[PDB]
Scaffold this active site. Sequence first.
Site, short mmCIF file in Angstrom:
data_model
loop_
_atom_site.label_atom_id
_atom_site.label_comp_id
_atom_site.label_asym_id
_atom_site.label_seq_id
_atom_site.Cartn_x
_atom_site.Cartn_y
_atom_site.Cartn_z
N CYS A 1 0.83 -1.23 0.00
CA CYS A 1 0.00 0.00 0.00
C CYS A 1 0.86 1.27 0.00
O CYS A 1 0.47 2.28 -0.53
CB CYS A 1 -1.03 0.05 1.13
SG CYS A 1 -0.29 0.02 2.78
N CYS B 1 25.76 36.12 10.29
CA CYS B 1 26.58 36.03 11.51
C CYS B 1 26.27 37.21 12.41
O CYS B 1 26.30 38.34 11.99
CB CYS B 1 28.06 36.03 11.20
SG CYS B 1 29.01 36.39 12.68
N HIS C 1 -1.58 1.51 7.70
CA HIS C 1 -2.10 1.40 6.37
C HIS C 1 -2.08 2.74 5.57
O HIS C 1 -2.32 3.82 6.12
CB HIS C 1 -3.52 0.82 6.49
CG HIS C 1 -4.09 0.38 5.19
ND1 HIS C 1 -3.52 -0.64 4.47
CD2 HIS C 1 -5.09 0.86 4.43
CE1 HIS C 1 -4.16 -0.79 3.32
NE2 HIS C 1 -5.12 0.11 3.27
#
Lengths: 319, 512, 75
Positions: A14, A135, A266
């Site tokens: 599936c 930075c 599933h």
Amino acid sequence: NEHYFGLVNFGNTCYCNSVLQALYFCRPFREKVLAYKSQPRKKESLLTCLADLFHSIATQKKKVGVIPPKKFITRLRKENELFDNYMQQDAHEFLNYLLNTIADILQEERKQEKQPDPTWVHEIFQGTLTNETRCLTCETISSKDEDFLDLSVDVEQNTSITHCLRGFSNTETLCSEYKYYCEECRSKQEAHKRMKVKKLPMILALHLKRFKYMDQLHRYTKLSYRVVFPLELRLFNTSGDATNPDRMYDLVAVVVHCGSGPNRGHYIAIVKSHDFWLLFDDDIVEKIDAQAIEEFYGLTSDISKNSESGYILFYQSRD
Amino acid sequence: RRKVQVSYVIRDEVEKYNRNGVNALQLDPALNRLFTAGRDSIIRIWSVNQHKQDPYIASMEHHTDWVNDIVLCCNGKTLISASSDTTVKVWNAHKGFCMSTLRTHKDYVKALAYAKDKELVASAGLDRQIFLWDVNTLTALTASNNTVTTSSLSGNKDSIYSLAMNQLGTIIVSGSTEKVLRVWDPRTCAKLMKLKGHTDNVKALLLNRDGTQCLSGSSDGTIRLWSLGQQRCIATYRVHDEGVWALQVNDAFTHVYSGGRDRKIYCTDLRNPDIRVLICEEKAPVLKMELDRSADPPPAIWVATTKSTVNKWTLKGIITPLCTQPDQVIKGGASIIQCHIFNDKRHILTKDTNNNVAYWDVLKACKVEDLGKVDFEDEIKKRFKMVYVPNWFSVDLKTGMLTITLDESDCFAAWVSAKDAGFSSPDGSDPKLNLGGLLLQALLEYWPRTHVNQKGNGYFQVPPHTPVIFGEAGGRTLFRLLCRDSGGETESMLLNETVPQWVIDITVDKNM
Amino acid sequence: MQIFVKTLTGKTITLEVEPSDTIENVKAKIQDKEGIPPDQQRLIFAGKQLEDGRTLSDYNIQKESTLHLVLRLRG
Ligand SMILES: [Zn+2]
């Protein structure tokens, strides 16, 4: 009109069937797969198999039915040891394998003739991010551009997918033990890090990161949070170019993962065809009204208990 | 715990000149002295006096990372320093040595604040913490019945980059990445105000004596003037293109001297903005500035940049520049800014701040050759070495000087034959050597505990003055000394307390 | 060289790596910061899931690259 065909589950395929259905209901992907003819007529690859399967659904005599994709699954198992078994797999990992495997095939064909050009997989799905790192002592910006085939976005409880996308592109501060090594400062400093979409993809595949690792307890859980996905989705960039993009996307397919946990479950795809919604559960094809789609946002409550939940969303750029 | 690593620094015994930029400055009017806080970890003392070929007085060496801010107090007797090594250090400023180390901060200590009247100092940093320090208590060598408590301000929601107090110690404020200023009364430790205004980080704060009015310099580009009494921004000054990092004010509190990323220093009349004197364009971004306060027309300003030289610029004239050449210049040295490690995992190529190129031996811990401004990437390919050696050390250029660090996880990965190392090995035929082991032994050679009833590895020595550092991985420093001084008694004692077991095994127990 | 990984909550960690490091090396460094065992990790970069046997230079991964970390929902 068109054909609506389920795919037979063979063991635990599936994860694969659900993704095929999504991809088949991505018209641009479907069409380019139907159009594929090999440059070398000789030999069988994962694409030729996908292409045979897709012709088969598309040229089927009746409007509705079931195909057993024996030959694609067989080829899948031959190509990839990770899928060479009857164990349950992750749909997103398969989607990534598939798309990249095709892309690799098409790239070989291009190279084949000539004896860094983009394949139609990249054309349909690739976008580009710009990552900026600022930075904080020196105030330099470093920009790096990184392509993607999808975005894997983290989730949080009772939010929309659009908020998740916002979260994804927010400015994070790298600090504490995550300081940025800055080449100007030759040292680790705190930094502002932001990833912004630089180029939008024709189809935006979203992967919901529905997992949480418990460092203490040595295992991970499945997040079954309510994460809401709208039928239409609006994306954009900010200024800095000849052109500013502000594009609507329409929801075309959701791959849903059913279960309370990560290690089993599933898969089912919901898809939009001709402005109404179908549900594909392997061989089963069933049409549902648009409001039924909200079951798949996830659970407000009883979060530990069993859920059916969106996992991969396909948004198609409106056309 | 954290893992403990071993480091050394390839350098000359005395580094007269700053080998990286300078983040802070202090003037002793009384003694005519300038203190510079190095990013080379070193604090320095200079005389600000007529035509001395060396204005160099002395180096104060204790810190292991950038020294970010320095305060001078108690009539120039004691210096307080804040560092990226996470410690605040207390120094005798006259003698130039370290009295105490404070370890309360858990991240880089970014800023210090001085209330002259109360002899009060405050420290803040990235750990979002602010501690208050009575300096006389910190420098008292007397035994005290009071258990030595600390008091902390709380409130900041992220990292603190600037801090300020008034002469009285009425009020204290901090600038953090969360854009607001936050205000406390030190003596109460209570929150008075939160000030909204800036759209970015704020790295510069000044206050008037009274604690009624504040100036703030921001990375958003705006300078601002605040009324603490009114709790509201009252003026906002857009004098720079890019962020403002450094502010000074005049004695009166009417003119602001501002500096930042865009290299341009402006005196600016607060009462009427439009009149702005563009003092100078520095060669690099301005980190901090210090006013000479001899006169009420303040004569000169000292300016700290990312470069190692320090300039005083005169203010004698009072949008082309007032000045084009430094009134007084303190010499700087070169920072090493690029490092390539060859595949032999023994040699380093560097390019420095003067585009100079050098070839270094990590194991023998010394320069091999000066190559003087050749093409650097060519040179890397020109000296390519077709060998596989595993990685066994990392390099750190934060101070501008080469710091080599050895960590347990791979200190011993590299096994190499003696001939390949280029050692004589005269007897018979040569064997496997492990470079990590050989270096650790060279470093701790003078340590008595190494000797077994011959000294070191035998094959070579490091420069006897090579400083060796023991420290936690991205954490606190346990101990430092010079290679040659490990033979001292107090030093040997400290080595027993700090050298970790993994180093012990190789150096004294003589294992592999 | 330093690279980033964007982790399951969104938060970004840094990793010190070398171009010759294998994806396995990388996942071990992830594990050190995050606790997540290499075999549960997947890393996406430039739209590709990175393969255990390969190196960062194999994928042209350079300083400041962001890897995206994901786990699995099996089904
Ligand atoms: Zn920097």
